Design a protein around this ligand. Sequence first.
Ligand code: I85
Length: 270
Amino acid sequence: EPKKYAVTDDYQLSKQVLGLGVNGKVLECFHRRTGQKCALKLLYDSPKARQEVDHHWQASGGPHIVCILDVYENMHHGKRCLLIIMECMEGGELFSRIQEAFTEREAAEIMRDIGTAIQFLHSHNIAHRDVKPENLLYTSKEKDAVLKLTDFGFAKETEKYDKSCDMWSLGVIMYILLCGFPPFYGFPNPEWSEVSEDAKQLIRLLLKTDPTERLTITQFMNHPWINQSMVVPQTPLHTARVLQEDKDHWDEVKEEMTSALATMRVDYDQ
Ligand SMILES: O=C(Nc1cc(-c2cc3c([nH]2)[C@]2(CCCNC2)CNC3=O)ccn1)c1cccc(C(F)(F)F)c1
């Protein structure tokens, strides 16, 4: 099912880059028959790159996951390559949309969306292991846009530990959603003043230092704040203001979280 004829027979490539995904750069392209703009991820062929395509195909179809359209096995400047054609997510990154009222109920909606995605993967015994702001994208800039998760370059077919790393990521994203800075912890006033006890409780249960004590996705999804996301108070939050105000170290917090996820993927630590 990976197509072996040239990707450029089906797609018109452009020289616009969306971003760097560890294995490969991401480029815009256009399907030739339809007009649709799509995203193309170039991976040099390796066991790891083959695992990514495998894990992404398996995940593709689930809720709130960026869909694969085609996969090509091509030669490119004398090197063997896998090209993942994905749907183009032109809404941009989760937290960029947010810094562009933002209530606690809206945050619950978002975390529920991300949770459904992780529920799908985990029930299919796939741990993502790289859930972080720049891997959470919107399909469009419109109001009806759908939040989706990409980047299976660190995904692993499962175990309880690898899954618990995803649940830690949910806690960190939820924390930043609720106030605008990461837990690098406590809940400092005045940002955490009118945030509900259920929100803080859920985050405590996810940010547990001991992975065994950490909530499972199925417990995450059954928590009132997620399960009853539609009756969470419409309480206005500081996040949008805080993000714009602290825009000059957003690259730092992204770098810090990438670093934290990296150390959780190590065989031995301390
Ligand atoms: O990135 C966009 N569309 C997009 C992007 C991806 C994508 C996949 C991967 C990544 N992006 C990254 C880029 C560097 C940051 N990490 C994630 C590395 N690894 C991936 O696996 C997939 C599908 N559509 C986009 C397109 C048009 C406009 C806009 C914007 F909203 F910025 F105006 C964004």
